[PDB]
Enzyme design. Structure first.
Site: not given
Ligand SMILES: *C(=O)N1C[C@H](NOS(=O)(=O)O)C=C(C)[C@H]1C(N)=O
Ligand SMILES: [Cl-]
Length: 267
Positions: A46, A49, A106, A108, A145, A212
């Site tokens: 993530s 982003k 985050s 998607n 993916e 993150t």
């Molecule tokens: C991104 O990696 N994500 C989205 C989400 N946000 O947590 S993070 O900002 O630390 O990534 C959570 C996830 C486990 C992850 C994902 N769903 O791909």
């Protein structure tokens, strides 16, 4: 000296959890740097982003996009973890709101809608990074993916140094003009997912903007931050981690601790 001692501590940390830590950190006031596996590759998850939001802002500044333009998707099946987009599905959102959701939550849906309609997909996102002189970054796949984090796979990866430098360019440099950079900075500061990582490594009175990533495979997770200490110049910290086994959980506390160490080395 301090650099030698910091190196030893990361190493112990990666052995302690049978994983792999990459670190880059910069004190913009003094020039002090520290790197550990800084030119090795790690999944972005993530964390890319944060850059996607920077790309959106550059497009607004170049006047190809308007920050208050409406983005409608009333019939779009939203991807897993679309907390913000899913509540605005009926009425759409503004560009800037969707992009800051992509960063701060985050989201998607926000991510893939933005890449589909404004940014030219993953190659367009890669191109944006190339255009600020980041030769390391690549995104190849869409959400979700892109989060496979398979060891030895260059897809959707970057290096800690390139992440740090790119962030320094976008948050602190002059890719973005004063007004647009202020916004980008605010987006970073209001990030909601980073409380147990780099923010946990710094006095509560320091200002942090961060993004993150958590792939949720191979224990892979990361955080990059601009940090404004009181009465001092900003710091830049980039922390990337993976783990040996597919089923391994990520470790927030290792990230926070590698951050403590990177910071002490450069200060
Ligand atoms: C991104 O990696 N994500 C989205 C989400 N946000 O947590 S993070 O900002 O630390 O990534 C959570 C996830 C486990 C992850 C994902 N769903 O791909
Ligand atoms: Cl898609």
């Amino acid at each position: 000296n301090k650099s030698d001692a910091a190196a030893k501590q990361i190493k112990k940390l990666e052995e302690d959890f049978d994983g792999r830590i990459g670190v880059f950190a910069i004190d913009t006031g003094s020039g002090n740097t520290f790197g550990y596996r800084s030119d090795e590759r790690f999944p972005l998850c993530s964390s890319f982003k944060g850059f996607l939001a920077a790309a959106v802002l550059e497009r607004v500044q170049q006047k190809k996009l308007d920050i208050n333009q409406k983005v409608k998707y009333e019939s779009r099946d939203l991807e897993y973890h679309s907390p913000i987009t899913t509540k605005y599905k009926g009425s759409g959102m503004t560009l800037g709101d969707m992009a800051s959701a992509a960063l701060q939550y985050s989201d998607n849906g926000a991510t893939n809608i933005i890449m589909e309609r404004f940014l030219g997909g993953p190659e367009g996102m890669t191109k944006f990074m190339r255009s600020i002189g980041d030769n390391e970054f690549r995104l190849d796949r869409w959400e979700l993916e892109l989060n496979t984090a398979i060891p030895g796979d260059k897809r959707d990866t970057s290096t800690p140094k390139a992440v740090a430098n790119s962030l320094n360019k976008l948050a602190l440099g002059n890719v973005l003009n004063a007004k647009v950079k202020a916004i980008y900075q605010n987006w970073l500061k209001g990030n909601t997912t980073g409380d147990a990582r780099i923010r946990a490594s710094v006095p509560a009175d320091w200002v942090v903007g961060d993004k993150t990533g958590s792939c949720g495979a191979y224990g892979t997770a990361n955080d990059y931050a601009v940090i404004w200490p009181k009465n001092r110049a900003p710091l830049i910290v980039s922390i990337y981690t993976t783990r040996k086994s597919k089923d391994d959980k990520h470790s927030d506390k290792t990230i926070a601790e590698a951050s403590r160490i990177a910071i002490q080395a450069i200060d």
